[PDB]
């Protein structure tokens, strides 16, 4: 997250870190057994880390649970990142508590102009590299479809939305991928892509979770 703020420990209790020997993506806990993340975060061998604040210090509220199954969306296209969504099943259910909690799936799609909370352990620099240890947060508005398409001509599908600031300075970034965009208390987006981070006229692009709720619900009823 570039241009964000330190969330505060366990104030985003649905945020997970995906670990394959190191943090590599975020995710969102949607019930005690299942995480939503980006399909481009697929790796074999994933351990889900819940209750994290500093990802490099065991502070006492973590739950580390191996994935048993990962399910990339059936129509995921890694070239365009259309349908950039994946489900991860935990080997055992998390213990839900004040620091480890699920986020609701949406009923309706969020609106342009709504301010959402984006979070993660990704790079904090637009130019260059610096990865924080503690979780970072950013409030960013959903942009109109027209603005999004103008920013990325020929690249935005109905399964994507833009959020952020066209002047630059504030955005998600590498290492935030797969993490949550929460608007009106529901999971409306997944950190997916963007041209650089926080550059002028190049807002973040996020997977439109409201289009996936029936797939998520039938998949978790079946696995």
Which residues contact Ca ion (rule: CB under 5 A)? Answer: 52, 54, 59
| Residues 39, 118: Cα–Cα separation, whole Å | 18
CA-closest candidate to residue 189, choices 161, 155, 147: 161
* Catalytically annotated residue among 37, 70, 177, 192: 177
Q: Cβ of residue 59: shortest distance to Ca ion, in angstroms? A: 5
* Catalytically annotated residue among 40, 53, 70, 102: 40
Annotated binding residue at 45? no
Query: CB-wise, 56 or 111, nearer to Ca ion?
Result: 56
Confirm whether 176 is a catalytic residue.
Answer: no
Compute how many other C-beta atoms are within 10 angstroms of the C-beta atom of residue 181: 29
Distance from CA of residue 113 to its chain's centroid? 19
Query: CB-wise, 10 or 70, nearer to Ca ion?
Result: 10
Sheet containing strand 204-208, edge to edge, reads: 5-6, 136-141, 115-120, 180-183, 186-193, 204-208, 160-163
Q: Cβ of residue 62: shortest distance to Ca ion, in angstroms? A: 5
DSSP-derived 3-state class of residue 219: helix
Annotated binding residue at 174? yes
DSSP-derived 3-state class of residue 29: strand
Annotated binding residue at 145? no
- The single residue listed with the structure tokens 């997970």 is 16
Torsion of CA 45, 51, 56, 60, to 10 degrees: -120
Annotated binding residue at 167? no
Query: CB-wise, 64 or 111, nearer to Ca ion?
Result: 64
Confirm whether 40 is a catalytic residue.
Answer: yes
Q: Which residues make beta-bridge pairs with 119?
A: 137
Q: Cβ of residue 74: shortest distance to Ca ion, in angstroms? A: 34
Query: CB-wise, 137 or 213, nearer to Ca ion?
Result: 137
Q: How many residues are given for the chain?
A: 223
Confirm whether 84 is a catalytic residue.
Answer: yes
Annotated binding residue at 56? no
CA-closest candidate to residue 209, choices 148, 153, 142, 144: 142
CA-closest candidate to residue 106, choices 184, 223, 28: 184
* Catalytically annotated residue among 23, 37, 73, 84: 84
Annotated binding residue at 123? no
Query: CB-wise, 63 or 126, nearer to Ca ion?
Result: 63
Q: Cβ of residue 187: shortest distance to Ca ion, in angstroms? A: 23
- Active centre residues (catalytic): 40, 84, 177
Question: Binding site: which residues?
Answer: 52, 54, 57, 62, 171-172, 174-175, 177
Known binding-site positions for Ca(2+): 52, 54, 57, 62
Binding annotation for substrate: 171-172, 174-175, 177
């Amino acid at each position: 997250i570039v241009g964000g703020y330190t969330c505060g420990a366990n104030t985003v209790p649905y945020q997970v870190s995906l670990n394959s020997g190191y943090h590599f993506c975020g995710g969102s806990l949607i019930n005690s057994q299942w995480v939503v993340s980006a399909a481009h975060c697929y790796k074999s061998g994933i351990q889900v880390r819940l209750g994290e604040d500093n990802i490099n210090v065991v502070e006492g509220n973590e739950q580390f649970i191996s994935a048993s199954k990962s399910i990339v969306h059936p129509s995921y296209n890694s070239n365009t990142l259309n349908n950039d969504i994946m489900l991860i099943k935990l080997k055992s259910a998390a213990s839900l508590n004040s620091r480890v909690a699920s986020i609701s799936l949406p009923t309706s799609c969020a609106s342009a102009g709504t301010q959402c909370l984006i979070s993660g352990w990704g790079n904090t620099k637009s130019s260059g590299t610096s990865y924080p240890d503690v979780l970072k947060c950013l409030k960013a508005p959903i942009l109109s479809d027209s603005s999004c398409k103008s920013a990325y001509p020929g690249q935005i599908t109905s399964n994507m939305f833009c959020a952020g600031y066209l002047e630059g300075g504030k955005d998600s970034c590498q290492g935030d991928s797969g993490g949550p965009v929460v608007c009106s208390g529901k999971l409306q987006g997944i950190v997916s892509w963007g041209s650089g981070c926080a550059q002028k006229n190049k807002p973040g692009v996020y997977t439109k979770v409201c289009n996936y709720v029936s797939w998520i619900k039938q998949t978790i009823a079946s696995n």
